[PDB]
Amino acid sequence: DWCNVSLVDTSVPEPGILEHDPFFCPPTEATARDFLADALVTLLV
Amino acid sequence: IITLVIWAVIRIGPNGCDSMEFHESGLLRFKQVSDMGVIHPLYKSTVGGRRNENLVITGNNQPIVFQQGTTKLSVEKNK
Numbered sequence: 302d303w304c305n306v307s308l309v310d311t312s313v314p315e316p317g318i319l320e321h322d323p324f325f326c327p328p329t330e331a332t333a334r335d336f337l338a339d340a341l342v343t344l345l346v
Numbered sequence: 347i348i349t350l351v352i353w354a355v356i357r358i359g360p361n362g363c364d365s366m367e368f369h370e371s372g373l374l375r376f377k378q379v380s381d382m383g384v385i386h387p388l389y390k391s392t393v394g395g396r397r398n399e400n401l402v403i404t405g406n407n408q409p410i411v412f413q414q415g416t417t418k419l420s421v422e423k424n425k
């Protein structure tokens with residue numbers, strides 16, 4: 302059938318990260334103190 | 347007498363009361379368990395946790411329900 306003869310040639314058909322930033326959540330930094338020496342002073346006076 | 351009553355009801359010792367202390371930077375630390383009842387955070391209140399630590403939100407034999415209107419996230423003991 303010559304009517305459905307198809308010819309095709311070459312053509313030019315030419316058509317991940319994860320991150321979220323919150324603002325802050327710092328813990329108790331510099332965790333050290335004492336309430337004896339000052340108590341000793343104010344109970345030694 | 348009333349000064350002794352003030353000393354004793356808050357249970358103050360030579361170090362201080364066995365409830366809390368005011369860290370000099372303003373950080374209100376506490377010293378033992380807390381029963382806060384209801385809590386209504388108003389302004390800039392992000393419930394977090396300490397560095398390199400895990401929030402452990404456990405319900406001692408009670409469910410936990412994240413509710414919003416109709417939407418529910420219910421984590422019960424077996425469902």
Ligand SMILES: *[C@@H]1O[C@H](CO)[C@@H](O[C@@H]2O[C@H](CO)[C@@H](O)[C@H](O)[C@H]2NC(C)=O)[C@H](O)[C@H]1NC(C)=O
Nearest residue numbers: 405406407408409410419420421422423424425
């Ligand atoms: C979670 O466990 C509880 C306690 O067993 C369940 O409550 C009852 O459990 C018994 C035996 O497992 C059943 O015969 C009853 O019918 C349960 N009552 C109700 C109201 O559920 C409960 O069902 C369990 N939940 C799930 C999702 O398994």
Ligand SMILES: *[C@@H]1O[C@H](CO)[C@@H](O)[C@H](O)[C@H]1NC(C)=O
Nearest residue numbers: 302303304305306307308309
């Ligand atoms: C190609 O074949 C189909 C199916 O038989 C037919 O419908 C169509 O008309 C044919 N095309 C031509 C150009 O004859």
